[PDB]
Design a protein around this ligand. Structure first.
Ligand SMILES: [Mg+2]
Ligand SMILES: [Mg+2]
Ligand SMILES: [Mg+2]
Ligand SMILES: [Mg+2]
Lengths: 48, 49, 102, 112, 154, 116, 145
RNA sequence: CAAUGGUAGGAGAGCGUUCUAAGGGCGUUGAAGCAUGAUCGUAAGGACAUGUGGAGCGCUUAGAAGUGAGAAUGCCGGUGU
RNA sequence: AACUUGGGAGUCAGAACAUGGGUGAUAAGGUCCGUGUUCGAAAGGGAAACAGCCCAGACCACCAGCUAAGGUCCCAAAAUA
RNA sequence: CCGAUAGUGAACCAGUACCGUGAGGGAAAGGUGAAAAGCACCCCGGAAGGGGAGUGAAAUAGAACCUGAAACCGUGUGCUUACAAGUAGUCAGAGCCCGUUAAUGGGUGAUGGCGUGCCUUUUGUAGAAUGAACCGGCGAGUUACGAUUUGAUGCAAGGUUAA
C-alpha cells in the first residue's frame, strides 16, 4: 500500500491531462451589457 | 643554477602511492588489502611472529 | 563511365568528377595520385579484368589529407571495476578524380 | 506595446493559481475580466486585481487603451514557501508546506 | 573526534529506528565532526652531512663566478647611513636589480643603507647561505670578506 | 593547506550530462543515471562498430542473390563461377553494379556462367 | 559509411502479382509468397523500408497437403480467458474459411515487427478463381518452386 | 619482426585541485566564478569565442598536502513523487 | 625458458562438463578424491533464450576478403544442390 | 593554518533558541552600495505587491539586497507521436527545420538490426540477494618516532655527530 516507484514527470503530466477548470457559463446581460452567469441574476444591475 | 629553473637529481625523487582514489590507479576499492579477514581491517594484521 | 578501383584494403566505384575518401596515402596536398589496381571499367564499354584490367589506370588529384571525426572507444565489465577509454581518429584523404583510362 | 503587472508572494499554492490562469490565456480583456469575476475559485479575486493593474498601467504609461487589449501571456510560478508542521499521532510530526505564487500578466495591443 | 565539543551520547538506539547506526554526533561523516588525519603540529627540518653542506656553498659561489656575477670591491667605507648613496654605488658598478652585498664583519652603515633598496640583501662573510647566493644574480664582495670566505670554505 | 573540491566536480558531471544530450526523460538531467547510460552507450557502440561490418555484408549478399536469380542462376554458383574465372570484385561493388549497370552485370554473369 | 544504396519512398515501385493456389502445397507456396512480398527478389532490396510487391492468391481452396495432416495439424488459439482454448483442424479451415488458412500460414513466415504487419497487409487471398482487384492490373506470377 | 582480454594483486607513466619559492605575465579597454557552443589531445583533461560578473588570476620549474566521490539503511541543506 | 637472492602482495567459500574411483540407491544441478578443459578472471560465433557445452582469446579504425563450430524453404546470410 | 557544511559549540547579543524533573545535552543563522545617495511624485490596490518617473556605474544591486549552479516548477514553440509489447541506448536510415569553433555541420527521427541499470557480495546475480527518491556540499591508508629494503647523493678504511 505504498508507491513501489516514482511517478515520472511524464506520467504525472499525463494523468492530469483531464484535470482542469471549465470557463464559466457566462452570457451577456440584456440590461447592462456586462457578463453574467446564465439563469442567475446579474450582480451588476440586478435584472431577471 | 637559477632558483626558477632548478631540477632535482635524476631518479632521486619519486611520487608516493596514494591509495583508495579511483579504480584506474589499480588500488581503488579495497586499497590493496584484499577482501575480508584481519588483513582487510584497520589496525588489523597479526602480531609479528 | 564508371571504374572500380582497389585501394588500401577495399574497393571503390568511381566516375570522373567525384570526391572520394580512402585510407591514408603518402602523397601531399595538390598532388596527383594514380591507381594501377583497376578491376572493372563499366558503362558504355565494359572491361572485366580477371584479377585486374591490364593497362587501365585511374588518376586523381589529392586534397585535404585529414583525420576523421573522433570516435571515443569505451568498454566496461560490470561489477569487476574495469573500464577503458581511448580516443581514435582514422586518417583519410579526399581525392577528386579527373581522368580515367581503359 | 506590452504592459506588465506582477503580484508577488501571493498566498496561494501555484498549482491552484494556474488552474484559473489556464482560461484567460490569449483572450480579450473584457472577456478575461468577465471570466475571473464569475469563476467561483479562490485565486480568482487576486488575479482579477493583477489584470486590473496591468490594464491601468497600460493606459497611464503607454496610452494603451483597454478596448483592444489581450492577455498576451499570463502565468504563475513558485514563491518563497513557508514551512509548518502538524502534530500527528504517536508523537510523530508531519510537515505542511504553505506555498506561494508569483503571478505575472502581460497584456498587448498585438501591434508593434 | 576527541577534540570537538561534546559528542558522547549514542545519538539513537542501535536497532529499531530505520536509521543508520551512529555512535556520536562528532563522527567524521557528520557535519561538524572530527577530522580524520589532517594537519598536526610538526617540524619539517632535516640535516645533511657537513661536507655536503660545504660543497653546496662552494657550488653556488662557483656558479656565480662562471656567470660573471662576482664583483670584488676593495672596501666600502660608508660613514653614515644614506640610501641614495648605496644606490649610486650599485648603479656605477652596473649591478643587476638583484644583488647580494657581502661585507667583512657586520658593517652597520652598509646594512642600514641597503635595507630599503628593493632587491638588495646585506650579509656577513660567515652568514653566507645558498638560498641567498642563488637568488642574487650578482655579488659584490669586500676584498677582506673574499679572503675570509676562501679560508673558511676551503 | 586545506583544498575544497569546488569547481572540479561541476565540470566533470556537466561534461557527461551534456554528453547524454537527448536521452529520454530523467536520463538527460541527472548525473547518477546519465553516467550509467553513457557507459552503456559506449559499450553498445563498441559492439555495433563490429556488427555493422557483417550487417552490410549480408545486405550485399541479399542484393546479389536477388540479382542472380533474374538470370536463372543462384548466388552460390555465381560466386563459385567468379572464383573460377579469377574475378575479384567485392560484394559491395557487385551489389552496386547490379543496381546501376544491368548490361555489365549480365556480361560478367555470362563470363561466370562460362567459367563453370 | 561510403556508398551503399538505400531505397526510400521516392524510388520504390511496387507491382501486383496474382498467384494461383491450385495444386500447390501450403508451405512450399507460402514461403515463396512471403519472399515475394518481403521484396527479397528486388535487387534494390532494403531492410528498413517496405520494398516488395503485392500478391493476390486466388484459388486458395485447391490446396493439397502431404501426409495425413488433413485430420492432424490442428491450429490452436486462445481467448485470454480461463479455459479458453479453442482448436480446429486444417481440413475444417480448408472447407470453411480457406482464405484464412493461407493468410495465416504466410503471416507466420514474416517478422512480427511493424514492417512485418505493413507487409502482411499487402496480401489478398481469395477462395475461388475470381479476384476483385482487376483495377490494379495484376500480372500473373508463376511459382519458382 | 614479435606482443597488447582480464578479477585479488605487483610494476610504470601520467591528468587534475589548494598553497608556497623564484622567474615571467594577464587584468574595469573587464579577473575568478557561472552558462552556452558544431574545438583540441590516446585518457585523466586542455583551450578559444560569446553572454552574465564586477576584482583578482594565470603560465614555466620546483616544492608541500585537509588533493579528486556514486553508493557506507552515510551527515547537513534544498526540492520532488 | 629455468634457477638463486632480495623488495611487494592476494589466495586457504570454488563451479560445471568429460573421464578413473570411493560414498549414495551403477539417486541428485549430491558428496569426497584423481586427470584434463572451461567459467571464476573471457568478450565474439553456434546451442531459441541459457557463467561452466562446441568453436574461438577482443590494441584501435574500415559500408574489404577467407574460414571454425553450426548451417543453406520463410522468420534469418547461404543448395527448394 | 581555516575562510562561513571550514575555522571555536559560538565571526551574527551562544553555552543563547531549544530539549530534559534534573545532572546534563545543545543548535541554526556573515556579505546592498563608493556614498544611504534606502526609490520626491504619479498610476492600479483596503493593504501586500506592482508599473512608470527619479538615485546610482549597475536596481534581474531595492533592503530576504554581491556572484546565483543543480534538483524542482512554469510559459512559449522547430521536429516528432493516437495498431502499439519499449534496462529506453546503440547502429542503419528517409522525411522535415536550421546554418558552425566549416567540418566530410547542428536539431528531430518514419522504419529495420542488436541490446535484461549500477554497485556490493559471491562458485554463480537482469536478479524477486544488498545499497542509493533526486540535486548540491562534506565525507576514509595521514603524522610522529624506530626498523628493513630500494633509488639518489656525499666520501670511503673509514663514515657520522647527539644534547
Ligand atoms: Mg502526545
Ligand atoms: Mg534490486
Ligand atoms: Mg523487479
Ligand atoms: Mg532501498
Amino acid at each position: 500500500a505504498v508507491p513501489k516507484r516514482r511517478t515520472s514527470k511524464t506520467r504525472k503530466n499525463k494523468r492530469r491531462t483531464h484535470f482542469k477548470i471549465s470557463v464559466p457559463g457566462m452570457t451577456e446581460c440584456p440590461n447592462c451589457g456586462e457578463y453574467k452567469l446564465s439563469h442567475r441574476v446579474c450582480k451588476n444591475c440586478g435584472s431577471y | 643554477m637559477k632558483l626558477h629553473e632548478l631540477k632535482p637529481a635524476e631518479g632521486s625523487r619519486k611520487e608516493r602511492n596514494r591509495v583508495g582514489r579511483g579504480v584506474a590507479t589499480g588500488n581503488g576499492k579495497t586499497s590493496g588489502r584484499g577482501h575480508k579477514g584481519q588483513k582487510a581491517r584497520s589496525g588489523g594484521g597479526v602480531r609479528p611472529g | 563511365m564508371f571504374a572500380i578501383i582497389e585501394t588500401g584494403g577495399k574497393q571503390i566505384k568511381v566516375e570522373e568528377g567525384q570526391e572520394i575518401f580512402v585510407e591514408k596515402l603518402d602523397v601531399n596536398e595538390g598532388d596527383t595520385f594514380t591507381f594501377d589496381k583497376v578491376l572493372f571499367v563499366g558503362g558504355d564499354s565494359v572491361k572485366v579484368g580477371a584479377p585486374t584490367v591490364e593497362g587501365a589506370t585511374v588518376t586523381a588529384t589529392v586534397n585535404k589529407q585529414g583525420r576523421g571525426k573522433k570516435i571515443t572507444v569505451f568498454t566496461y565489465k560490470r561489477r569487476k571495476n574495469s573500464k577503458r577509454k581511448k580516443g581514435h581518429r582514422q586518417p583519410y584523404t579526399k581525392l577528386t578524380i579527373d581522368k580515367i583510362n581503359a | 506595446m506590452e504592459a506588465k503587472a506582477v503580484a508577488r508572494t501571493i498566498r496561494i499554492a501555484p498549482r491552484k493559481v494556474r488552474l484559473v490562469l489556464d482560461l484567460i490565456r490569449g483572450k480579450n480583456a473584457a472577456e478575461a475580466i468577465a471570466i475571473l469575476k464569475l469563476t467561483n475559485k479562490a485565486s480568482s479575486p487576486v488575479i482579477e486585481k493583477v489584470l486590473m493593474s496591468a490594464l491601468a498601467n497600460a493606459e497611464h504609461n503607454y496610452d494603451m487603451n483597454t478596448d483592444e487589449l489581450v492577455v498576451k501571456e499570463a502565468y504563475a510560478n513558485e514563491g518563497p514557501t513557508l514551512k509548518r508542521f502538524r502534530p500527528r499521532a504517536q508523537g510523530r510530526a508531519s510537515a505542511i508546506n504553505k506555498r506561494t505564487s508569483h503571478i505575472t500578466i502581460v497584456v498587448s495591443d498585438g501591434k508593434e | 573526534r576527541s577534540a570537538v565539543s561534546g559528542g558522547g551520547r549514542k545519538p539513537w538506539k542501535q536497532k529499531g529506528t530505520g536509521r543508520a547506526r551512529q555512535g556520536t554526533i562528532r563522527a567524521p561523516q557528520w557535519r561538524g565532526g572530527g577530522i580524520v588525519f589532517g594537519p598536526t603540529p610538526r617540524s619539517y627540518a632535516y640535516k645533511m652531512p657537513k661536507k655536503m653542506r660545504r660543497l653546496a656553498l662552494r657550488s653556488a659561489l662557483s656558479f656565480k663566478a662562471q656567470e660573471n656575477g662576482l664583483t670584488v670591491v676593495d672596501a666600502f667605507n660608508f660613514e653614515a647611513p644614506k640610501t641614495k648613496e648605496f644606490k649610486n654605488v650599485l648603479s656605477t658598478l652596473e649591478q643587476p636589480k638583484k644583488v647580494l652585498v657581502v661585507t667583512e664583519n657586520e658593517d652597520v652603515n652598509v646594512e642600514l643603507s641597503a635595507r630599503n633598496i628593493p632587491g638588495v640583501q646585506v650579509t656577513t662573510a660567515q652568514g653566507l647561505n645558498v638560498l641567498d647566493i642563488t637568488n642574487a644574480d650578482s655579488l659584490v664582495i669586500t676584498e677582506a670578506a673574499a679572503k675570509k670566505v676562501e679560508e673558511v670554505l676551503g | 593547506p586545506r583544498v575544497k573540491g569546488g569547481t572540479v566536480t561541476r565540470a566533470r558531471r556537466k561534461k557527461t550530462i551534456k554528453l547524454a544530450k537527448g536521452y529520454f526523460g530523467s536520463k538527460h538531467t541527472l548525473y547518477k543515471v546519465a553516467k550509467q547510460q553513457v557507459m552503456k552507450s559506449g559499450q553498445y557502440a563498441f559492439r555495433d562498430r563490429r556488427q555493422r561490418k557483417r550487417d552490410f555484408r549480408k545486405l550485399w549478399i541479399t542484393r546479389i542473390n536477388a540479382a542472380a536469380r533474374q538470370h536463372e542462376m543462384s548466388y552460390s554458383r555465381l560466386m563459385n563461377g567468379l572464383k573460377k574465372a579469377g574475378i575479384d570484385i567485392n560484394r559491395k561493388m557487385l551489389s552496386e553494379i547490379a543496381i546501376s549497370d544491368e548490361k555489365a552485370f549480365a556480361q560478367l554473369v555470362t563470363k561466370a556462367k562460362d567459367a563453370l | 559509411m561510403r556508398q551503399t544504396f538505400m531505397a526510400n519512398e521516392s524510388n520504390i515501385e511496387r507491382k501486383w502479382y496474382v498467384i494461383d493456389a491450385e495444386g500447390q502445397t501450403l508451405g512450399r507456396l507460402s514461403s515463396e509468397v512471403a519472399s515475394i512480398l518481403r521484396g527479397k527478389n528486388k535487387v534494390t532490396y532494403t531492410p528498413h523500408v517496405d520494398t516488395g510487391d503485392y500478391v493476390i492468391v486466388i484459388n486458395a481452396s485447391k490446396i493439397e497437403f502431404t501426409g495425413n495432416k488433413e485430420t492432424d495439424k490442428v491450429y490452436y488459439r486462445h481467448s485470454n480467458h480461463p479455459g479458453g482454448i479453442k482448436s480446429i483442424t486444417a481440413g475444417e479451415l480448408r472447407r470453411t474459411n480457406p482464405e484464412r488458412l493461407i493468410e495465416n500460414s504466410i503471416k507466420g513466415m514474416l517478422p512480427s515487427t511493424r514492417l512485418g504487419e505493413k507487409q502482411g497487409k499487402k496480401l489478398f487471398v481469395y477462395g475461388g478463381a475470381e479476384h476483385p482487384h482487376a483495377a490494379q492490373q495484376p500480372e500473373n506470377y508463376e511459382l519458382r518452386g
